[PDB]
Amino acid sequence: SHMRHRTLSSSPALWASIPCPRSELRLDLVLASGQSFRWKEQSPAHWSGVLADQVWTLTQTEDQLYCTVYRSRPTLEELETLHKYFQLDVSLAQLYSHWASVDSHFQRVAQKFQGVRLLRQDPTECLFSFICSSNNNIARITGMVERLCQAFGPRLIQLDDVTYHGFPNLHALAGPEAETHLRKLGLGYRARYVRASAKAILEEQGGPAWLQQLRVAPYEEAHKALCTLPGVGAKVADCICLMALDKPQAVPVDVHVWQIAHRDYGWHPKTSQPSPLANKELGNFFRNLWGPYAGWAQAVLFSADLR
Ligand SMILES: Cc1cc(C)n(-c2ccc(CC(=O)Nc3noc4c3CCCC4)cc2)n1
């Protein structure tokens, strides 16, 4: 039978519910605010994309986050995977308070941008999503991640005129053919780096259990370990640390962070010398204003900066 992208209108039988205030999560602010690049609004206010090799459509009211899956409706198993994805364990309201009480600029911005939170992403997925492109702009990375998924990850399902592949496994990326293929897709020289990091993870660190150990490790160790990988520098490593390795204190520094720091906070390098040195300084700067969940505080201001 031909499968359509579902709505709350087309087939109510096929939806479960997670009790979730629109104060703790706005999907229109999280799913395409530069954290994950695999979610798409196919029909109005309905978010469809791949998660852990299963296709989901998501939507919400003021009370309830509504979920449907494409493999019948979601289990406890499958709803516990969304609960940990959105990190609903953590009270965002108790962060938007603590960030308010130290940051007057937050309190003004955070009126209009409620319910921005971090996703807990898959380490492999996140790592390769950030090394396949410049990270110039959301649209660039979103297209590259799709091309990458279309050619290296297994076909999963058709929905309307759209075919969903899963995120590539390390073996598909690590093969002796990977680069020449990846360069078809437009990755340029970053095709070298995609292969070599996959090769490195499988054949020198024990495969993805390595990244799970970094998730267990403290921030500094995982960062450092992430930078030994080809194609990974300081910004990408903090992205991964923040977004996949449970390091809320990570503050990935790039030219938008600089722009926000300077215009909105009055910040300049105390070194008096953008550089490796000064960027490290700016991330120290933000950790010390915002606290242990500093990245999550960045997330809000990034949503606010895209509008
Ligand atoms: C026009 C414009 C304005 C902005 C802020 N971007 C933009 C945003 C996002 C990305 C991808 C990226 O790098 N995301 C992140 N890096 O650190 C963080 C994130 C996401 C969550 C909070 C920590 C690229 C561009 N584009």
Length of the chain: 307
Q: What CA–CA distances, in Å, run from 6 to 26, 82, 162, 202, 292? A: 20, 18, 13, 38, 39
Amino acid at residue number 202? L
- Give the integer Cα–Cα distance in Å for 158 and 71: 11
Resolution value in angstroms: 2.3
Q: Which two tokens stand for residue 18?
A: 């997670």
Q: Ligand 1 centroid vs 34 CA: distance in angstroms?
A: 5
Q: What are phi and psi of 218, to 5 degrees?
A: -75, 160
User: Which DSSP category does 167 fall into?
Assistant: P
What is the Cα Rg of the chain in Å? Answer: 20
Is 184 a catalytic site residue? no
Specify the experimental method.
X-ray
Atom of ligand 1 nearest to the CA of 302: 5
User: According to the annotation, is 35 in a ligand binding site?
Assistant: no
Q: Ligand 1 centroid vs 302 CA: distance in angstroms?
A: 6
**Domains of the chain: which residue ranges?**
1-86, 90-110+251-306, 122-247
Q: Give yes or no for a contact between 29 and 303, defined as CB atoms under 8 angstroms apart.
A: yes
Q: What are phi and psi of 43, to 5 degrees?
A: -115, 160
User: According to the annotation, is 256 in a ligand binding site?
Assistant: yes
Q: Give yes or no for a contact between 50 and 156, defined as CB atoms under 8 angstroms apart.
A: yes
